[PDB]
Design a protein around this ligand. Structure first.
Ligand SMILES: Cc1nc2scc(-c3ccc(F)cc3)c2c(=O)[nH]1
Length: 144
């Protein structure tokens, strides 16, 4: 809720989408969270998403992290179809006005981009995970 370190970034947001029910921001307590800025029509994103999905499947429990899609999709059908390819969570389509604001907050200058955040404190703990996933698809230097 308001306690979450993520709350400062997602002011008008309560829940995130998951593969089952919606989950509270408080459910991410204690986790490392990767904010994944992406879009369904972006070719580098389309190429990276399955790589990240493999990374998530292998490591998300062992290394206690979550991924949250922050989608640049303007079309709701595209948003749901593309998030449907992903195992992790998503900022709901109804919050999409905040996407450009979030990008500006973290200095996102292109996508795909991962921003690594401490969920509890909201501290930025990395901005280059999109690159580190390529070089180190196994666990070695967590959370970079
Ligand atoms: C393919 C693609 N799609 C998109 S959708 C939004 C971006 C983008 C561009 C510049 C920025 F400063 C932030 C996001 C972006 C991009 O860089 N590449």
């Amino acid at each position: 809720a308001m306690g979450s370190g993520l709350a400062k970034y997602l002011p008008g947001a309560t829940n995130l989408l998951s593969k089952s029910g919606e989950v509270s921001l408080g459910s991410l307590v204690g986790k490392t969270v990767f904010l994944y800025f992406s879009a369904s029509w972006c070719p580098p994103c389309r190429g990276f998403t399955p790589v990240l999905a493999e990374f998530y499947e292998k490591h998300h429990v062992a290394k206690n992290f979550e991924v949250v899609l922050i989608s640049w999709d303007e079309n709701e059908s595209d948003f749901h179809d593309y998030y449907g390819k992903m195992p992790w969570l998503a900022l709901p389509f109804d919050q999409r006005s905040t996407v450009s604001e979030l990008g500006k907050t973290f200095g996102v200058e292109s996508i795909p981009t991962l921003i690594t955040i401490n969920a509890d404190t909201g501290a930025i703990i990395g901005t280059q995970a999109r690159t580190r996933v390529i070089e180190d698809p196994d666990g070695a230097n967590f959370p970079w």
